Design a protein around this ligand. Structure first.
Ligand SMILES: Nc1ncnc2c1ncn2[C@@H]1O[C@H](COP(=O)(O)OP(=O)(O)OP(=O)(O)O)[C@@H](O)[C@H]1O
Ligand SMILES: Nc1ncnc2c1ncn2[C@@H]1O[C@H](COP(=O)(O)OP(=O)(O)OP(=O)(O)O)[C@@H](O)[C@H]1O
Ligand SMILES: [K+]
Ligand SMILES: [Mg+2]
Ligand SMILES: [Mg+2]
Ligand SMILES: [Zn+2]
Lengths: 624, 176, 639
DNA sequence: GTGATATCTGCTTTGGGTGGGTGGGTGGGTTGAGGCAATA
């Protein structure tokens, strides 16, 4: 009774918070924020809301303190209050919407996060805020919220038994409640779960790795298990950087020591986090963002603005920064009626001298790309890059795990030290670079995966520094791999008095400026916005060449082929850099990328002119 | 019609103010506004009341129906019934918004009043949603909506009327 | 209770329709063809009783129980003896289920206790096992028989009955089982996996577990693309009086469909007329129409058409074998559309298995052992070439395959059999497939001044196992460059009629099929200016659907070699083999062997198939000789 | 009336993957593919 009274009072306070909370001022106006959000979400068929802890503290500090210290009970009370308020906001309801739905209440806060390493025993059963990286996600499974049980002998049924949230089970009644007289006694453990009477929700399990910068020196990164349910399920994927609010909890399995439990230490338990809210970190588009993106795409010098924003810390490399912008946006993937596909992704290779910021460029593109994976050729294998076959520990069966080019599907994979890769490992990438699939036939698995990613590779020349006398001996790659690159840049560290003085002053100023507090630059776009702008354009615009632009491209391609053919004849050596139909389609992709920057449905002659200029400076220069 | 124009119509309702100035009877085209005497109550249109309050010339008095007990009874009655119940004012939402935004210092228990008016608004909006769904689903040609205020109709009227126009044209396709 | 009676009444009213007669006739056919499952179209039920259809789709188990009871009553009404014959009659569903059309990714907990239609690929199958339904026991002392019924969580009315058979009567007298009087039903388990092309970016496909019982067993095998209509259920379990609250979910199938052309009389007439129209142009037109988006490699396309049509395999009274499958190898310079031709065959051929040299192993090509899901029994799982039995295997990057892995392909390429002698398993598997392989030369880019044998870099036996070898060269020629550039740019300018300007292809896709039967033939494709150009259109293109029907019909013909064709083939083989240094520049790409004679016969037979002719005539032999002449020799340039 | 001693009751077993890989492979499970060091 007294406990019931206390619970009812707390639920009433949560209900009043939901009914009365307001944002605004008497000069402007007022909005009942949470009541309105609940009403709109329920009408949309989305039975969840997100509540800020600061708002709750503003309304009632004690309620927020209780929610922080004892999250489970008070969160249950808050959900019941949310259900009550959802009935009142929507209470006269249309036919087929009679039954009131449960409301999931998500939690959000402005507090500073805490690390995995800082999670101690004294914080058990508390509300915690943790940053990390998603490294693994399980399949979506069913978790019972309500069960009905029936007696084997007498068919006596107990219905609507509530289940605990999280990774917690239930202990069935030991004995039945039927009358002792007349009937032979019911057997021990008489109850079984009725399949069709059970109410279930979707659940998921995740692994959260600590942030790379938080790892103590010389230690392998640690991870933690996450439990997600209902609308939190299937929100994040491996590779996402997130901040999670949750309950630090313990797995509650059977009390019995079944199979003769024989742990290496006594009284140990398994920890996990019961997730109450997820926030994806930058490192859907609001209408304000969409309007801002449309404004950027319409700037007459948008191409210059984007190029200036790519690795602004690097001193020069304007042509290579322009080509990287095209790679980030990409071309238009197409499927012809016969079923054959033409890829829209752009591949770029930087081959050149040491200390020319090739690795710094690759690191930037990893941060800038909406989907980006950085790997090293030396530290890679054929199975690691594409996909692997291995034994599943639980099932005792063969499974498949994706490599770098599966994790980078839909984005960019940056392969540094490309020359150090073994020939057998390099050759495993040919199919993925052109057909954009990975074919596997191993250990009884015959399947095909998607690998629609752009390759950005860096390498050194054969003799360390490019030697003009050695000629074609500077390049070691086969013609097959080189023909799969849209643009090939030969980077030569040219020594000049005037440029060297300018570069040195830039580098010194860069090191001194590390102390300066960060400031915006008028002519550039910050990385966070550029990252979002790229993602928006790739989903919204797939351009095509205009009929006039195609005629211009056709005529220049024929000239380029004749010049390459003539050059090989005169030199008596077949050139290392080939000029094939793939290079014609490469120019099409680069032209479409330039249009996609401007959100233009058709690529013009100016787009083809710029695409041909980029090709001239990159690949024709290498080939001649 | 937009919401600003419904508010314009609502601003013609009469409220009571206590001025701190003296003025002779004003012969407005709309109608006479009695003499103004400091400390004594007088009835004026809502627009003039708001203007005088903003200029620090008067103190507003809550309408008779802006009472917590009465409003609670009205909200309970609205929740119990199936149709729309008669409202204390034909512009209760606009009057509440204007009065509570500009004169909360003059109206005790303004927060409770605002919450009760919000409850009534939500219930009535849901009833209107049910009415529209029934109109379309059952293929009606006419409906009765008594005790529904102008602001409530205007909140979704254009959408409903456009949908009904399209549906009527689809119902009369086969007639040559 | 009352609701169940009303549902049974409604279903009985639905099946007694003589007063349009579709289900009365369907049940009569069910009786005639010795079946005990009736497939019901939910569209008819929805038309006649909408509420009963909604309940059936949303409360599946109870409604299906009532439906099957009504079906049993109706069948008994038509014929009582037949009803006594079978323990139970089952109902399958088809049609449009609205939002119940899902994939293994979209099949969530909200569909529990509902009827759903799932589309996917079969990845795992199990062995068929019997499941006891009713047990009969006899008491020799007391001379009376007792029956028992069993059910489990997987039955429509879930109940965990005991698996232990009775052994004695209430009186101590012992009991013996009447196995021939009891009832057992077949039971099998499969896994259905999301189609990889539909998966979201960076995500490995999801899967669901399906239970097939009775007739539905063995309707699907691994590698098939299937549509399964069934009911979605959770299987709750306990151990030591404890439940985790996390339950496995299964799909209990009521219908399995495959995703074999169906021929109407009009289509048959069209095919016959097409065959009759021209004598010599049919083959050329079909080959020209094969992969429209590739600018011409005309001889290669003719060879690929021959591969798709195939030859006639010979079985001799003694038991010797001669294959009819045609194998093709394409070695070329970078970017000459080899992989695109392989991909086209993968997209078009009825059974085609893709493979990459670097991504495949001998085990994965032939077969693998592992423990059985149940009992841990050493079992065999088919590899790529066995899955391709009576089909095609497309091997890209053939030169990248390991030599040991390559050696495992010889026996399949020549004899068509795989010998498994491992883990205490001795089996001979049928892998009767055509190999279409693509490769690069040893130096990446073909060196015209070196000989074909030095460029190809493969052993003469493996080359001999290929019916045809094609060296595809990229020669910079301004006119050929102009033609190919025009074709490629036209292809890249094309936009499908449905799409709008500026549209981008999404990565992944939602379920698009909203019915079991597609709600949506012409010989020639309609002209499109971009796809075909502004040329006068003197050459016409055969449409993809008509080509698929025509090739299916032609593959069944078995032309018979005639004396004149045999004489011509023998003379031409003699000329091909005798001719040494026929052209001083010329060199042989592959050695000429009796396999070359068999290849000539195979190509002539395939050509005769294309004409739908019952005999191999001189024209077919001439075409085969022309193909072999083109493929087997290459000029060597002198510097 | 106490000491056996006969009857009755509840526990958990099995090897198994819905019981974990945050138990451990010195507690015990074929087949294949994938990194190493030494190898040629
Ligand atoms: N143009 C430049 N502007 C600014 N910083 C530069 C520039 N070139 C080099 N640096 C700096 O000098 C160092 C060059 O190292 P980095 O790894 O980027 O070179 P790299 O060209 O990839 O060389 P390597 O081929 O030897 O791997 C980094 O600190 C980079 O920031
Ligand atoms: N003759 C052609 N007609 C049409 N498209 C062509 C032609 N030749 C090449 N292409 C196009 O150019 C690209 C060639 O890539 P593809 O994978 O087909 O080449 P490949 O011969 O298999 O090369 P590799 O040996 O390097 O794998 C594809 O886009 C293909 O569509
Ligand atoms: K164990
Ligand atoms: Mg570097
Ligand atoms: Mg290829
Ligand atoms: Zn009981």
């Amino acid at each position: 009774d007294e406990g019931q009274a206390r619970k009812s009072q707390l639920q009433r306070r949560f209900k009043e918070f939901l009914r009365q909370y307001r944002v605004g001022t008497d000069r402007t106006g007022f909005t009942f924020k949470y009541r309105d959000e609940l009403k709109r979400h329920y009408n949309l068929g989305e039975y969840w809301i997100e509540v800020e802890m600061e708002d709750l503290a503003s309304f009632d500090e004690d309620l927020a303190d209780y929610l922080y210290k004892q999250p489970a009970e008070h969160l249950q009370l808050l959900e019941e209050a949310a259900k009550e308020v959802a009935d009142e906001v929507t209470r006269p309801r249309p036919s087929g919407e009679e039954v009131l739905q449960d409301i999931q209440v998500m939690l959000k806060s402005d507090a500073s996060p805490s690390s995995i390493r800082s999670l101690k025993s004294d914080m058990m059963s508390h509300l915690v805020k943790i940053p990390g990286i998603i490294i693994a996600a399980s399949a979506v499974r069913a978790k019972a919220t309500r069960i009905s049980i029936q007696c084997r002998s007498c068919r006596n049924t107990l219905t609507n038994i509530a289940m605990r949230p999280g990774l917690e089970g239930y202990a069935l009644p030991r004995k039945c409640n039927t009358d002792q007289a007349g009937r032979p006694k019911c057997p021990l453990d008489p109850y079984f779960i009725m399949p069709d009477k059970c109410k279930c929700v979707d659940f998921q399990t995740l692994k959260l790795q600590e942030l790379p910068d938080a790892v103590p020196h010389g230690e392998m990164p640690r991870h933690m298990q996450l439990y997600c349910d209902r609308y939190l399920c299937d929100k994040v994927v491996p590779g996402n950087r997130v901040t999670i609010m949750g309950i630090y909890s313990i797995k509650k399995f059977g009390l019995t020591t079944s199979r003769g439990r024989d742990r290496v230490g006594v009284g140990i338990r398994s920890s996990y986090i019961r997730v109450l809210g997820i926030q994806v970190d930058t490192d859907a588009v609001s209408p304000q963002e969409e309007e801002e993106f449309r404004r950027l795409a319409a700037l007459p010098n948008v191409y210059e603005v984007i190029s200036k924003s790519i690795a602004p810390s690097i001193f020069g490399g304007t042509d290579m920064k322009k080509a990287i912008a095209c790679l980030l946006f990409g071309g238009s993937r197409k499927r012809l009626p016969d079923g054959l596909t033409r890829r829209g992704d752009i591949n770029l290779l930087m081959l050149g001298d040491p200390g020319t910021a090739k690795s710094q460029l690759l690191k930037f593109v990893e941060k800038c790309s909406p989907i980006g994976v950085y790997t090293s050729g030396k530290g890679s294998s054929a199975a690691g890059l594409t996909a692997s076959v291995m034994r599943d520990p639980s099932s005792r069966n063969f499974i498949m795990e994706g490599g770098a080019m599966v994790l980078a599907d839909g984005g960019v994979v940056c392969i540094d030290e490309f020359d150090k890769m073994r020939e057998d490992d390099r050759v495993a990438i040919h199919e993925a670079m052109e057909q954009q699939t990975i074919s596997i036939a191993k250990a009884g698995i015959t399947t095909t995966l998607n690998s629609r990613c752009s390759v950005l590779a860096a390498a050194n020349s054969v003799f360390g520094r490019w030697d003009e006398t050695k000629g074609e001996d500077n390049i070691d790659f086969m013609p097959t791999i080189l023909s799969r690159f849209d643009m090939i840049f030969i980077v030569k560290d040219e020594h000049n008095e005037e440029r060297d003085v300018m570069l040195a002053k830039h580098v010194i100023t860069l090191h001194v400026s590390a102390l300066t507090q960060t400031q915006a630059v008028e002519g550039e776009i910050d990385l966070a916005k550029l990252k979002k702008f790229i993602a928006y354009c790739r989903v919204k615009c797939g351009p095509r060449l205009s009929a006039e632009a195609a005629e211009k491209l056709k005529n220049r391609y024929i000239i380029m082929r004749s010049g390459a053919r003539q050059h090989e004849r005169d030199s008596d050596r077949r050139s290392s850099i080939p000029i094939t139909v793939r290079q014609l389609e490469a120019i099409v992709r680069i032209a479409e990328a330039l249009s996609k920057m401007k959100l233009q449905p058709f690529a013009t002659e100016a787009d083809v002119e710029e695409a041909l200029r980029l090709f001239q400076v990159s690949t024709l220069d290498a080939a001649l | 019609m937009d919401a600003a124009e419904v508010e314009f119509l609502a601003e013609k309702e009469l409220v009571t103010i206590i001025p701190n100035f003296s003025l002779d009877k004003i012969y407005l085209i709309g109608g006479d506004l009695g003499p103004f005497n400091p400390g004594l109550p007088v009835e004026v249109p809502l627009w003039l009341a708001i203007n005088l309050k903003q200029r620090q010339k008067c103190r507003l008095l809550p309408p008779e129906w802006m009472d917590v007990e009465k409003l609670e009874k009205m909200r309970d009655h609205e929740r119990k019934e199936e149709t729309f119940t008669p409202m204390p004012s034909p512009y209760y939402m606009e009057l509440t918004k204007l009065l509570l935004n500009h004169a909360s210092d003059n109206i005790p228990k303004a927060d409770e009043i605002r919450t009760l008016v919000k409850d009534m608004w939500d219930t009535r909006i849901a009833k209107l949603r049910v009415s529209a769904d029934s109109f379309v689903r059952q293929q009606e040609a006419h409906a009765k909506l008594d005790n529904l205020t102008l602001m409530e109709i205007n909140t979704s009227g254009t959408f409903l009327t456009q949908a009904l126009n399209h549906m009527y044209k689809l119902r009369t396709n086969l007639q040559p | 209770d009352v609701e169940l009676r009303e549902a049974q009444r409604d279903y009985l009213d639905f099946l007694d329709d003589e007063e349009q007669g579709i289900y009365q006739s369907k049940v009569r056919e069910l009786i005639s063809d010795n079946q005990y499952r009736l497939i019901v179209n939910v569209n008819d039920l929805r038309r006649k009783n909408e509420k009963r259809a909604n309940r059936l789709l949303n409360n599946a188990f109870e409604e299906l129980v009532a439906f099957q009871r009504a079906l049993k009553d109706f069948v008994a009404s038509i014929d009582a003896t037949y009803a006594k014959q079978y323990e139970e009659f089952y109902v399958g569903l088809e049609g449009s289920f609205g939002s119940k059309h899902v994939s293994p990714r979209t099949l969530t907990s909200c569909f529990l206790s509902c009827v759903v239609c799932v589309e996917g690929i079969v990845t795992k199958c199990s062995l068929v096992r019997p499941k006891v339904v009713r047990s009969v026991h006899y008491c020799p002392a007391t001379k009376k028989t007792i029956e028992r019924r069993y059910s489990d969580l997987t039955t429509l009315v879930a109940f965990p009955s005991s698996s232990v058979y009775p052994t004695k009567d209430e009186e101590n007298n012992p009991l013996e089982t009447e196995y021939g009087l009891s009832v057992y039903k077949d039971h099998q388990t499969i896994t259905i996996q999301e189609m990889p092309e539909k998966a979201p970016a960076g995500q490995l496909p999801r899967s669901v577990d399906v239970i097939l019982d009775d007739d539905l067993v063995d309707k699907a095998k691994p590698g098939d693309r299937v549509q399964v209509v069934g009911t979605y259920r959770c299987l709750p379990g306990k151990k030591g009086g404890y439940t985790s609250g996390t339950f496995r979910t299964v799909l209990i199938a009521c219908n399995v469909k495959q995703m074999q052309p169906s021929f109407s009389a009009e289509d048959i007439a069209k095919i016959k007329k097409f065959s009759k129209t021209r004598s010599k142009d049919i083959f050329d037109q079909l080959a020209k129409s094969l992969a429209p988006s590739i600018h011409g490699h005309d001889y290669v396309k003719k060879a690929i058409l021959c591969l798709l049509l195939g030859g006639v395999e010979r079985d001799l009274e003694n038991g010797s074998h001669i294959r009819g499958d045609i194998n093709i190898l394409l070695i070329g310079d970078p970017s000459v559309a080899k992989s695109q031709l392989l991909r086209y065959v993968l997209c078009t051929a009825p059974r085609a298995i893709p493979t990459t040299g670097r991504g495949s192993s001998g085990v994965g090509l032939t077969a693998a052992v592992t423990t059985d899901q149940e009992t841990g029994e050493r079992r065999l799982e088919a590899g790529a070439m066995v899955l391709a039995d009576r089909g095609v295997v497309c091997i890209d990057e053939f030169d990248k395959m390991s030599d040991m892995d390559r050696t495992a392909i010889h026996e399949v390429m020549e004899q068509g059999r795989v010998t498994i002698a491992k883990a205490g398993i001795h089996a001979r598997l049928n892998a009767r497939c055509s190999v279409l392989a693509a490769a690069n030369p040893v130096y990446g880019r073909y060196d015209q001044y070196k000989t074909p044998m030095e460029n190809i870099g493969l052993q003469d036996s493996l080359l001999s196992r290929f019916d045809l070898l094609f060296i595809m060269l990229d020669q910079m020629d301004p006119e050929q460059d102009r033609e190919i550039s025009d074709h490629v740019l036209r292809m890249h300018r094309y936009r499908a009629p449905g799409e709008q300007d500026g549209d981008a292809m999404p990565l992944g896709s939602a379920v698009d099929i909203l019915a079991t039967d597609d709600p949506n033939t012409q010989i020639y494709e309609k002209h499109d200016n971009l796809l075909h150009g502004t040329k006068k259109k003197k050459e016409k293109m055969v449409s993809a659907a008509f080509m698929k029907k025509y090739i299916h019909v032609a593959k069944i013909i078995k032309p018979v070699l005639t004396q004149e064709s045999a004489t011509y083939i023998a003379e031409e083989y003699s000329r091909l083999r005798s001719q040494d240094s026929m052209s001083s520049d010329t060199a042989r790409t592959s050695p000429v062997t009796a396999r070359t004679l068999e290849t000539l016969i195979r190509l002539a037979t395939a050509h005769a198939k294309a004409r739908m002719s019952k005999t191999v005539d001189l024209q077919d032999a001439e075409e085969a000789v022309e193909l072999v002449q083109y493929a087997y020799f290459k000029k060597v340039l002198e510097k």
